PDB file of C-alpha atoms in Angstrom:
ATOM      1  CA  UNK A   1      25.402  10.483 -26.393  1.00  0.00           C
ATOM      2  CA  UNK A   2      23.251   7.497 -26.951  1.00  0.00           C
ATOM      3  CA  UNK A   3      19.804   6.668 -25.115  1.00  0.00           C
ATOM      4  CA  UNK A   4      21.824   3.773 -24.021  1.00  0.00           C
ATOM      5  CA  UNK A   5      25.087   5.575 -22.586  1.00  0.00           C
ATOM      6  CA  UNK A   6      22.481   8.088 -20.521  1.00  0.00           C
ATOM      7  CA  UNK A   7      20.814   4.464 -19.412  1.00  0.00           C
ATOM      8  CA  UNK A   8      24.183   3.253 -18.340  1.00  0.00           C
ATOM      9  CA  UNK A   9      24.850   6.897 -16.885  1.00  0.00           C
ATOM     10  CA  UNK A  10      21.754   7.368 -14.715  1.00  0.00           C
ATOM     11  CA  UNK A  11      22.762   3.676 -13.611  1.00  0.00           C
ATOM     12  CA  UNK A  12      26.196   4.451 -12.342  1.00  0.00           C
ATOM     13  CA  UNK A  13      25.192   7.928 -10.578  1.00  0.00           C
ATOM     14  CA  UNK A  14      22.555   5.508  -8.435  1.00  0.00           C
ATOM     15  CA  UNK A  15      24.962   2.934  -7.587  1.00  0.00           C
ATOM     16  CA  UNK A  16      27.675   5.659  -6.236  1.00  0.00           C
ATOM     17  CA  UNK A  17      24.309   7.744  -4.181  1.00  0.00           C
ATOM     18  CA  UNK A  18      22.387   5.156  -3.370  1.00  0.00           C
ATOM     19  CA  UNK A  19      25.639   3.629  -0.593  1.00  0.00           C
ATOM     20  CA  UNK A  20      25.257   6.631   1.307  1.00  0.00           C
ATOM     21  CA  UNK A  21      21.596   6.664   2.401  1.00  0.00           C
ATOM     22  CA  UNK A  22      18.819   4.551   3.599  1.00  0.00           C
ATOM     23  CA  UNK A  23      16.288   5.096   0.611  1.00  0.00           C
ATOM     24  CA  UNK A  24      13.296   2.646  -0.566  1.00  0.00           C
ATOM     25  CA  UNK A  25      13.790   0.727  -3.995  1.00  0.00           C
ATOM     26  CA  UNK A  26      10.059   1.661  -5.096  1.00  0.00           C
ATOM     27  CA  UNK A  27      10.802   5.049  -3.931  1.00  0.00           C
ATOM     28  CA  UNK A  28      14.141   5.186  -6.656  1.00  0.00           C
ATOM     29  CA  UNK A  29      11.684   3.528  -8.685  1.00  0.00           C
ATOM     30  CA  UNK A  30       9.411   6.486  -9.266  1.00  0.00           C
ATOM     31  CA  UNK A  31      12.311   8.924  -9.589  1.00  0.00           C
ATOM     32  CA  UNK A  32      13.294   7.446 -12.164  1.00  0.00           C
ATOM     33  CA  UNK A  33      10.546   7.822 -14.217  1.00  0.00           C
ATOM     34  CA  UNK A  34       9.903  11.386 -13.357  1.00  0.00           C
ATOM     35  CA  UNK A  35       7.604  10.725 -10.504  1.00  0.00           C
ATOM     36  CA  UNK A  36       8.353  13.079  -7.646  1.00  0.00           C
ATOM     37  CA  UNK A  37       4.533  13.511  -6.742  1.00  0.00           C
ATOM     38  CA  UNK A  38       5.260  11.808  -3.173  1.00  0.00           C
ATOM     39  CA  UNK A  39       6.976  12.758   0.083  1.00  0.00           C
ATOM     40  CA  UNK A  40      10.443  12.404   0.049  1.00  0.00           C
ATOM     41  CA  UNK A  41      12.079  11.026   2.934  1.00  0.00           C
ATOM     42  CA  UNK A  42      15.202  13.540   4.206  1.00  0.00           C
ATOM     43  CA  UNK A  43      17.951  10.807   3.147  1.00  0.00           C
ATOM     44  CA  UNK A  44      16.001  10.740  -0.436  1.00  0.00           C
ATOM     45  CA  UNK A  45      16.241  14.382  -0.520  1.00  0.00           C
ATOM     46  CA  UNK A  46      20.106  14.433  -0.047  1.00  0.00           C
ATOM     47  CA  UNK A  47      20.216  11.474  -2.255  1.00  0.00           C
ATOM     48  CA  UNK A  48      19.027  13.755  -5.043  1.00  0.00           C
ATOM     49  CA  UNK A  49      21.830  16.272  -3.629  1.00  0.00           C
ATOM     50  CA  UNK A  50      24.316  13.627  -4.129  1.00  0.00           C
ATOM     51  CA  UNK A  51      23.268  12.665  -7.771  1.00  0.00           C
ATOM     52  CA  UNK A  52      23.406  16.180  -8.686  1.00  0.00           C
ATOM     53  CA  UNK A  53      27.065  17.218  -7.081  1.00  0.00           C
ATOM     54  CA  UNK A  54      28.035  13.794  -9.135  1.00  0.00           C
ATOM     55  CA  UNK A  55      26.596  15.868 -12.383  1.00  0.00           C
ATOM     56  CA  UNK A  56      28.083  18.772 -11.140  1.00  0.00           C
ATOM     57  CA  UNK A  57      24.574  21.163 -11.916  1.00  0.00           C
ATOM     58  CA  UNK A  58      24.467  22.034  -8.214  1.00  0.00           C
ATOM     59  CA  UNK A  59      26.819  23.173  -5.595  1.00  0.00           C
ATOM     60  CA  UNK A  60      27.405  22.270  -2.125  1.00  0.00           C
ATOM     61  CA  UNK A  61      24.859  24.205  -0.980  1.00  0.00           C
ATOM     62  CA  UNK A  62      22.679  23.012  -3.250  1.00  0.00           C
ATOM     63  CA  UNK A  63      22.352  26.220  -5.548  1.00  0.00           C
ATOM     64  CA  UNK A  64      21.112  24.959  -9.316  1.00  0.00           C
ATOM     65  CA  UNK A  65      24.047  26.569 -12.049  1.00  0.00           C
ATOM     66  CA  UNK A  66      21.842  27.047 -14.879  1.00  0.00           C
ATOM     67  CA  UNK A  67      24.600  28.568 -17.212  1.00  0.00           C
ATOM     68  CA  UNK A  68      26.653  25.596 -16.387  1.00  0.00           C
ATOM     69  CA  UNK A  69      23.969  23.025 -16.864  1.00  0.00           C
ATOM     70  CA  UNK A  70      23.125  24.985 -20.120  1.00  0.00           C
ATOM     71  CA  UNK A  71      26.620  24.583 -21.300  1.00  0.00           C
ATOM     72  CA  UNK A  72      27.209  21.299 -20.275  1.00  0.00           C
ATOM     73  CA  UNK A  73      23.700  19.915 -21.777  1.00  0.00           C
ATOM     74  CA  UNK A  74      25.081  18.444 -24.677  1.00  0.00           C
ATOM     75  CA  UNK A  75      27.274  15.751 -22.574  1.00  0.00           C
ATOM     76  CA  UNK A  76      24.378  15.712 -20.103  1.00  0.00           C
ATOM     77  CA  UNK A  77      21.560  14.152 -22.081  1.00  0.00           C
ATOM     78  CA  UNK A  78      21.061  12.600 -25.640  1.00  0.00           C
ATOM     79  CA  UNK A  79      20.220  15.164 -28.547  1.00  0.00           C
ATOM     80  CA  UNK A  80      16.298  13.913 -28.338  1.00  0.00           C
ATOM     81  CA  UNK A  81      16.540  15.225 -24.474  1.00  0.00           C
ATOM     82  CA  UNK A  82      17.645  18.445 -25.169  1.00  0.00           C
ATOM     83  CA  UNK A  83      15.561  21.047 -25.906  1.00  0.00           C
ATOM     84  CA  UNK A  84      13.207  19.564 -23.255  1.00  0.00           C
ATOM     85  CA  UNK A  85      16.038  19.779 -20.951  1.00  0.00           C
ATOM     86  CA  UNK A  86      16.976  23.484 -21.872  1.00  0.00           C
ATOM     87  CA  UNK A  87      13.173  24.577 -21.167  1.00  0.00           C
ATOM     88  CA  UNK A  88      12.992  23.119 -18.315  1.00  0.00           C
ATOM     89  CA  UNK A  89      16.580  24.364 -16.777  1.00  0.00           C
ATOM     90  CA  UNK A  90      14.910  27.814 -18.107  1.00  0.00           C
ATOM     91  CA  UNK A  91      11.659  27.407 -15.903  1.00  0.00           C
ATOM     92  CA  UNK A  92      13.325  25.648 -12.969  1.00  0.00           C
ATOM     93  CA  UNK A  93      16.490  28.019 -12.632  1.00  0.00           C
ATOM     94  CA  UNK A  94      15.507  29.950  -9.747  1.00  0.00           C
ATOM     95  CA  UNK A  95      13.360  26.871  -7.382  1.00  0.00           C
ATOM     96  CA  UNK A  96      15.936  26.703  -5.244  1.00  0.00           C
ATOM     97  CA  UNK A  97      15.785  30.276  -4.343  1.00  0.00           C
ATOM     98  CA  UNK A  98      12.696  29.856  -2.169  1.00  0.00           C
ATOM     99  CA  UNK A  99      14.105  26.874   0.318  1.00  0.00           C
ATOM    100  CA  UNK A 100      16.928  26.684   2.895  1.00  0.00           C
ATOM    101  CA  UNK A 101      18.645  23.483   3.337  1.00  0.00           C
ATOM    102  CA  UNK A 102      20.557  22.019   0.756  1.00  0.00           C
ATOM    103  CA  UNK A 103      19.480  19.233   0.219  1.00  0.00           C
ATOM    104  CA  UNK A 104      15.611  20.318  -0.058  1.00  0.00           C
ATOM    105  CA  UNK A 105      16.711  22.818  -2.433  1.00  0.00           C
ATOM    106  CA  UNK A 106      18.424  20.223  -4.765  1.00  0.00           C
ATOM    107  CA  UNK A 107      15.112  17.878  -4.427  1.00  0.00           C
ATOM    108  CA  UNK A 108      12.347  20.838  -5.340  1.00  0.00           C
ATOM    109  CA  UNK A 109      14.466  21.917  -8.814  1.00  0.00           C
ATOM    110  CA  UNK A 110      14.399  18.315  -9.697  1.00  0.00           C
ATOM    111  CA  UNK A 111      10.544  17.683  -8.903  1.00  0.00           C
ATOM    112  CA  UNK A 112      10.626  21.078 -10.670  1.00  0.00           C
ATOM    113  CA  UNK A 113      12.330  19.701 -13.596  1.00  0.00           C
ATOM    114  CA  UNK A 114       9.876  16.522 -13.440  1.00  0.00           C
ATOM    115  CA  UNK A 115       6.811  19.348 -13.210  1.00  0.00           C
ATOM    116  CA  UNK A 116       7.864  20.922 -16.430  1.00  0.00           C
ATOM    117  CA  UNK A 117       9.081  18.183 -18.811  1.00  0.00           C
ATOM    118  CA  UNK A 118       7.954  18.316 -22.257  1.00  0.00           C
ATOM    119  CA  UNK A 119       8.006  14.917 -22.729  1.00  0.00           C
ATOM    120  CA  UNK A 120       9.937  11.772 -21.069  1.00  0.00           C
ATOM    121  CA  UNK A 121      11.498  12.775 -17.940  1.00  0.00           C
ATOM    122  CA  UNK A 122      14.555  10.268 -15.898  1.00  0.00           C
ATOM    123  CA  UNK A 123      16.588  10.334 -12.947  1.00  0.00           C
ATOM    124  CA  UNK A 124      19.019   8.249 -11.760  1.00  0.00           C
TER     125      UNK A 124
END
């Protein structure tokens, strides 16, 4: 995978999520750069549900699949992401674990992810 087909990828996922919610531009902004120190808005937390399912790394009830997001790294991010990715699947496996709704779940591992990334950190 390229830096420029994850680009294109993190584009797409947005366009399909975005539809579904009422969400603020600046506040896809930030995401996208790894910025989850703000409060998310409920529709921004399902949003983050949404992009996820689309990924396929979570479930319906938003439970993280770290062996499945493990396995499926490789057509997940380009080579350069990797390892950064894999360390931070490894620290972020079991966030979820501590929250009840689905959505919120989904939305703390990915600030979790943006918490713990070696490096540069994107979502769509």
């Amino acid at each position: 995978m390229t830096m420029e087909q994850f680009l294109t990828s993190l584009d797409m996922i947005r366009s399909g999520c975005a539809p579904k919610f009422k969400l603020k531009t600046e506040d896809l902004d930030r995401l996208r750069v790894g910025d989850f120190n703000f409060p998310p808005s409920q529709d921004l937390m399902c949003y983050t549900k949404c992009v996820s399912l689309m990924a396929g790394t979570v479930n319906k009830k938003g439970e993280f699949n770290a062996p499945k997001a493990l396995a499926q790294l490789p057509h997940l991010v380009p080579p350069e992401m990797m390892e950064m990715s894999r360390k931070s699947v490894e620290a972020c496996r079991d966030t979820h674990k501590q929250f009840k709704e689905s959505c919120e779940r989904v939305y703390q591992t990915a600030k979790c992810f943006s918490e713990n990334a070696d490096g540069q950190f994107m979502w769509p």
